[PDB]
RNA sequence: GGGAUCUGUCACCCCAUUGAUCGCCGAGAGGCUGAUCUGGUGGUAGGCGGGUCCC
């Protein structure tokens, strides 16, 4: 894929960025 | 060696469900991070590896 990440609504987002 | 913007990672919470899909529990609406993905120089919230720019 052109890009990727690791994010989960209702729980976490600073786990990636 | 230091700081931030960049990236990769890990326990917290917010915002968008007129952003997208699923799973589980629930007669039922409803609930759960339960799994995944996306987005906010939202957060002097914490740590660590790589790279960039400045000093």
Swiss-Prot record:
Entry's transmembrane regions: none
Family label: Belongs to the lentiviruses Tat family.
Additional free-text comment from the UniProt record: This truncated variant has a premature stop codon. It may have arose as a consequence of tissue culture passaging. HIV-1 lineages are divided in three main groups, M (for Major), O (for Outlier), and N (for New, or Non-M, Non-O). The vast majority of strains found worldwide belong to the group M. Group O seems to be endemic to and largely confined to Cameroon and neighboring countries in West Central Africa, where these viruses represent a small minority of HIV-1 strains. The group N is represented by a limited number of isolates from Cameroonian persons. The group M is further subdivided in 9 clades or subtypes (A to D, F to H, J and K).
Posttranslational modification: Asymmetrical arginine methylation by host PRMT6 seems to diminish the transactivation capacity of Tat and affects the interaction with host CCNT1.
Function (record text): Transcriptional activator that increases RNA Pol II processivity, thereby increasing the level of full-length viral transcripts. Recognizes a hairpin structure at the 5'-LTR of the nascent viral mRNAs referred to as the transactivation responsive RNA element (TAR) and recruits the cyclin T1-CDK9 complex (P-TEFb complex) that will in turn hyperphosphorylate the RNA polymerase II to allow efficient elongation. The CDK9 component of P-TEFb and other Tat-activated kinases hyperphosphorylate the C-terminus of RNA Pol II that becomes stabilized and much more processive. Extracellular circulating Tat can be endocytosed by surrounding uninfected cells via the binding to several surface receptors such as CD26, CXCR4, heparan sulfate proteoglycans (HSPG) or LDLR. Neurons are rarely infected, but they internalize Tat via their LDLR. Through its interaction with nuclear HATs, Tat is potentially able to control the acetylation-dependent cellular gene expression. Modulates the expression of many cellular genes involved in cell survival, proliferation or in coding for cytokines or cytokine receptors. Tat plays a role in T-cell and neurons apoptosis.
Listed Basic residues bias regions: 5-16
Domain notes: The cell attachment site mediates the interaction with ITGAV/ITGB3 and ITGA5/ITGB1 integrins, leading to vascular cell migration and invasion. This interaction also provides endothelial cells with the adhesion signal they require to grow in response to mitogens. The Cys-rich region may bind 2 zinc ions. This region is involved in binding to KAT5.
Location of this chain's protein in the cell: Host nucleus, Host nucleolus; Host cytoplasm; Secreted
Organism this protein belongs to: Human immunodeficiency virus type 1 group M subtype B (isolate HXB2) (HIV-1)
Name of the protein in question: Protein Tat
Residues of the full protein shown: 44 to 60 of 86
Residues spanned by motif Nuclear localization signal, RNA-binding (TAR), and protein transduction: 6-14
Native organism taxonomy: Viruses, Riboviria, Pararnavirae, Artverviricota, Revtraviricetes
List of residues that carry N6-acetyllysine: 7-8
Residues carrying Asymmetric dimethylarginine: 9-10
Subunit structure and binding partners: Interacts with host CCNT1. Associates with the P-TEFb complex composed at least of Tat, P-TEFb (CDK9 and CCNT1), TAR RNA, RNA Pol II. Recruits the HATs CREBBP, TAF1/TFIID, EP300, PCAF and GCN5L2. Interacts with host KAT5/Tip60; this interaction targets the latter to degradation. Interacts with the host deacetylase SIRT1. Interacts with host capping enzyme RNGTT; this interaction stimulates RNGTT. Binds to host KDR, and to the host integrins ITGAV/ITGB3 and ITGA5/ITGB1. Interacts with host KPNB1/importin beta-1 without previous binding to KPNA1/importin alpha-1. Interacts with EIF2AK2.
């Amino acid at each position: 894929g052109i890009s990727y990440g690791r994010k989960k609504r209702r729980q976490r987002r600073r786990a990636h960025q």
